Design a protein around this motif. Structure first.
Motif, PDB file in Angstrom:
ATOM      1  N   UNK A  23       0.779  -1.239   0.000  1.00  0.00           N
ATOM      2  CA  UNK A  23       0.000   0.000   0.000  1.00  0.00           C
ATOM      3  C   UNK A  23       0.802   1.276   0.000  1.00  0.00           C
ATOM      4  N   UNK A  24       1.958   1.216  -0.662  1.00  0.00           N
ATOM      5  CA  UNK A  24       2.779   2.369  -1.021  1.00  0.00           C
ATOM      6  C   UNK A  24       2.099   3.088  -2.177  1.00  0.00           C
ATOM      7  N   UNK A  25       2.474   4.344  -2.405  1.00  0.00           N
ATOM      8  CA  UNK A  25       1.771   5.208  -3.352  1.00  0.00           C
ATOM      9  C   UNK A  25       1.861   4.981  -4.859  1.00  0.00           C
ATOM     10  N   UNK A  26       0.698   4.881  -5.498  1.00  0.00           N
ATOM     11  CA  UNK A  26       0.549   4.388  -6.880  1.00  0.00           C
ATOM     12  C   UNK A  26       1.645   4.933  -7.813  1.00  0.00           C
ATOM     13  N   UNK A  27       2.098   4.093  -8.756  1.00  0.00           N
ATOM     14  CA  UNK A  27       3.087   4.471  -9.790  1.00  0.00           C
ATOM     15  C   UNK A  27       2.448   3.945 -11.087  1.00  0.00           C
ATOM     16  N   UNK A  28       2.290   4.872 -12.015  1.00  0.00           N
ATOM     17  CA  UNK A  28       1.891   4.627 -13.395  1.00  0.00           C
ATOM     18  C   UNK A  28       3.105   4.366 -14.326  1.00  0.00           C
ATOM     19  N   UNK A  29       2.850   4.187 -15.624  1.00  0.00           N
ATOM     20  CA  UNK A  29       3.925   4.116 -16.643  1.00  0.00           C
ATOM     21  C   UNK A  29       3.409   4.211 -18.079  1.00  0.00           C
ATOM     22  N   UNK A  30       4.020   5.106 -18.873  1.00  0.00           N
ATOM     23  CA  UNK A  30       3.561   5.434 -20.247  1.00  0.00           C
ATOM     24  C   UNK A  30       3.475   4.185 -21.154  1.00  0.00           C
ATOM     25  N   UNK A  31       2.781   4.315 -22.275  1.00  0.00           N
ATOM     26  CA  UNK A  31       2.686   3.196 -23.152  1.00  0.00           C
ATOM     27  C   UNK A  31       4.042   3.031 -23.683  1.00  0.00           C
ATOM     28  N   UNK A  32       4.433   1.788 -23.913  1.00  0.00           N
ATOM     29  CA  UNK A  32       5.798   1.522 -24.322  1.00  0.00           C
ATOM     30  C   UNK A  32       6.727   1.775 -23.158  1.00  0.00           C
ATOM     31  N   UNK A  33       6.202   1.943 -21.950  1.00  0.00           N
ATOM     32  CA  UNK A  33       7.065   2.034 -20.777  1.00  0.00           C
ATOM     33  C   UNK A  33       7.004   0.750 -19.994  1.00  0.00           C
ATOM     34  N   UNK A  34       8.014   0.503 -19.132  1.00  0.00           N
ATOM     35  CA  UNK A  34       8.178  -0.811 -18.493  1.00  0.00           C
ATOM     36  C   UNK A  34       6.954  -1.348 -17.749  1.00  0.00           C
ATOM     37  N   UNK A  35       6.988  -2.650 -17.441  1.00  0.00           N
ATOM     38  CA  UNK A  35       5.801  -3.437 -17.066  1.00  0.00           C
ATOM     39  C   UNK A  35       5.308  -3.385 -15.624  1.00  0.00           C
ATOM     40  N   UNK A  36       6.226  -3.377 -14.676  1.00  0.00           N
ATOM     41  CA  UNK A  36       5.863  -3.211 -13.273  1.00  0.00           C
ATOM     42  C   UNK A  36       6.316  -1.810 -12.804  1.00  0.00           C
ATOM     43  N   UNK A  37       5.370  -0.979 -12.359  1.00  0.00           N
ATOM     44  CA  UNK A  37       5.660   0.437 -12.046  1.00  0.00           C
ATOM     45  C   UNK A  37       6.672   0.643 -10.907  1.00  0.00           C
ATOM     46  N   UNK A  38       7.378   1.778 -10.936  1.00  0.00           N
ATOM     47  CA  UNK A  38       8.520   2.110 -10.035  1.00  0.00           C
ATOM     48  C   UNK A  38       8.360   2.071  -8.492  1.00  0.00           C
ATOM     49  N   UNK A  39       9.453   1.711  -7.795  1.00  0.00           N
ATOM     50  CA  UNK A  39       9.505   1.636  -6.321  1.00  0.00           C
ATOM     51  C   UNK A  39       8.650   2.715  -5.620  1.00  0.00           C
TER      52      UNK A  39
END
Length: 453
Positions: A23-39
Motif C-alpha cells: 500500500x505504497x503510493x501508486x506508480x503509473x507508466x507510459x505506453x511503451x514504458x516498463x511493465x511493473x511500475x517504479x519503487x
C-alpha cells in the motif's frame, strides 16, 4: 489492464489511494514504458471500458466474436483476485451501463474471481471499507463465509492472507455467487446483457481442501444452472491438472488448457516449458468439449513465447498456426500474433501496443487469414483428427469427417527439407486442386512450397 485505455477518470492517478499499505503510493507508466511500475508503487496501464466497443473493429471486425477475459470486479490491484464489491462492474473498468450496451455491442466472454475472496472486501473488510467487520466481530450477515480462527494467517489461497478462503457450502454462499437471483453471473445472465459465459479460477482447491465432492456439485449444481437460463451457457473451471473434474459432460462442457496446447508443443516450437524449463521433442475428454476446450498462449502465472522463441521471428507464426487447425475453443494470448514480449510476472503482463502490428510485419496477413481460414473452414473446427508424418523438421496431420478437408504440413528447419504430404489414405480425387498457391493431389502426396520454417 494491458488492453486499452478508455477513461482518464477511471484511470486513477498515482498516490490516489493505497492497498494494504504499503500500500505504497501508486506508480503509473507510459505506453511503451516498463511493465511493473517504479519503487514506492506499481502499476496500472491499459484495459478500460469504452474503447473495445471501438476496438472490436480491431478485435471483432472482422476477426474475433467473443472475448475470453479475466476477473471483472473490485480489487484495488491491477489483477483483482480479491473481490471487494461484487455485483457492479469494477469502477476502473467503469460500471455495467456503459457496459450494459457493450455485451450487446459486443453482440463476448468473461472470468470469475469468486474462488479467492477479498480481505478488504466490502463486508468482512480488514482495512474496513465495508461496514461489516468480521475481522473484529462475530455478529454479521457476512461473517461465517469463513469459519473461526479468524486471526493472522492460516489455510486460504495456497496460504495467502489477502485472499482469504471461504466456508463454501449449501445452502450457504454462492447465493450471490452463481445460484441465485442475487448471484451476479445470474445477476448478469439476462437482458439486456445476457451472459454468453463465465470462468472458474483454480477452484481445484475449492471447497475445504479441494478435490472432494465439494469442489464439484458446487459445480454440478451450476450445470443445471448453466442449463437454466441459457442453453448458450458455456463453462470452465481452473485446474492446472489433467481434466476430469474438468468434465464428464456431467461435470463440465469446457475447460482451460496448459496441458492442451500451451505446455505440450513449445518443446517443439517455443522449445520448452511455459515455466521456461527447456524441452527436446522430435517425431481423454469427450467429443463435444474437444472442439470446445479453451486455447491461448501465455498467462500471468508464467513466462512468454519470445523468451522461448529462438529469438526467431519465424518460430511464432509457425506456432500460431498450430492454434488454428487446433480444436477446443481458442481464447488466444493477445500479442499472440504481433511478436511482443512479457518477462516474468508481473512483467509477463505487458501493454497492448499499435506499431509493430502492420502486416508488413508478416504477422498480419498470417494470423489474420489463419483464423479467417478456420472460419472458412470447419475442418479446423469440428473435424475428426488424424496425425501424419513423423519427421525431424516436419510434422503432418489432418482433421477428418464427412463434408470437407484440410491436412496441415509444417517445416521445422532453418532450411527446408522437401516433404511430400500424401493424401491418398485421404481417398479423395488426385491430380486435383487444393486451394492455395497452389497444389495438385497428384502423386497422392502434396508437392507445394512454403519458406524455411
Amino acid at each position: 489492464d494491458r488492453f486499452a485505455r478508455s477513461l482518464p477518470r477511471e484511470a486513477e492517478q498515482d498516490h490516489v489511494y493505497y492497498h494494504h499499505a504499503a500500500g505504497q503510493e501508486i506508480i503509473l507508466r507510459d505506453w511503451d514504458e516498463p511493465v511493473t511500475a517504479q519503487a514506492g508503487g506499481s502499476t496500472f496501464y491499459g484495459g478500460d471500458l469504452d474503447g473495445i466497443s471501438e476496438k472490436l473493429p480491431y478485435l471483432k471486425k472482422l476477426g474475433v466474436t467473443a472475448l475470453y477475459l479475466n476477473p471483472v470486479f473490485k480489487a484495488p490491484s491491477v489483477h483483482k483476485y480479491d473481490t471487494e464489491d461484487y455485483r457492479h462492474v469494477d469502477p476502473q473498468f467503469g460500471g455495467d451501463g456503459a457496459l450494459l450496451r457493450l455485451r450487446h455491442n459486443t453482440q463476448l466472454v468473461l472470468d470469475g474471481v469468486f474462488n479467492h475472496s477479498g480481505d478488504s472486501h466490502a463486508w468482512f473488510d480488514r482495512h474496513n471499507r465495508g461496514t461489516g467487520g468480521a475481522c473484529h466481530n462475530p455478529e454479521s450477515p457476512w461473517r461465517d463465509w469463513y469459519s473461526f480462527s479468524d486471526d493472522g494467517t492460516a489455510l486460504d489461497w495456497l496460504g495467502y492472507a489477502s485472499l482469504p478462503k471461504l466456508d463454501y457450502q449449501s445452502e450457504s454462499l454462492v447465493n450471490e455467487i452463481y445460484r441465485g437471483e442475487d448471484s451476479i453471473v445470474r445477476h448478469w445472465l439476462k437482458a439486456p446483457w445476457n451472459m454468453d459465459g463465465w470462468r472458474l479460477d483454480v477452484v481445484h482447491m475449492l471447497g475445504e481442501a479441494g478435490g472432494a465432492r465439494n469442489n464439484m456439485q458446487h459445480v454440478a449444481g451450476i450445470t443445471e444452472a448453466a442449463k437454466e437460463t441459457q442453453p448458450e451457457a458455456y463453462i470452465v473451471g481452473e485446474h492446472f491438472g489433467d481434466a476430469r473434474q474438468w468434465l464428464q459432460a456431467d461435470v463440465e462442457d469446457a475447460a482451460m488448457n496448459y496441458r492442451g496446447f500451451t505446455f505440450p508443443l513449445w518443446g517443439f516450437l517455443a522449445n520448452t516449458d511455459i515455466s521456461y524449463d527447456p524441452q527436446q521433442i522430435d517425431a481423454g475428454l469427450s467429443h463435444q468439449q474437444q472442439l470446445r476446450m479453451f486455447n491461448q498462449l501465455d498467462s500471468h502465472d508464467t513466462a512468454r513465447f519470445k523468451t522461448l522463441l529462438g529469438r526467431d521471428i519465424a518460430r511464432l507464426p509457425l506456432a500460431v498456426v498450430w492454434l488454428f487447425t487446433w480444436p477446443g475453443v481458442p481464447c488466444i494470448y493477445y500479442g499472440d500474433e504481433v511478436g511482443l514480449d512479457g518477462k516474468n510476472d508481473p512483467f509477463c503482463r505487458k501493454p497492448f501496443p499499435w506499431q509493430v502490428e502492420k502486416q508488413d510485419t508478416a504477422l498480419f496477413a498470417l494470423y489474420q487469414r489463419m483464423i479467417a481460414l478456420r472460419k472458412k473452414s470447419q475442418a479446423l473446427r469440428h473435424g475428426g483428427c488424424q496425425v501424419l508424418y513423423a519427421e525431424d523438421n516436419v510434422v503432418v496431420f489432418v482433421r477428418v469427417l464427412n463434408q470437407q478437408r484440410v491436412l496441415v504440413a509444417i517445416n521445422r528447419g532453418e532450411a527446408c527439407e522437401v516433404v511430400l504430404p500424401a493424401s491418398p489414405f485421404l481417398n479423395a480425387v488426385q491430380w486435383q486442386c487444393k486451394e492455395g498457391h497452389g497444389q495438385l493431389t497428384d502423386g497422392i502426396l502434396a508437392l507445394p512450397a512454403i519458406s524455411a520454417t
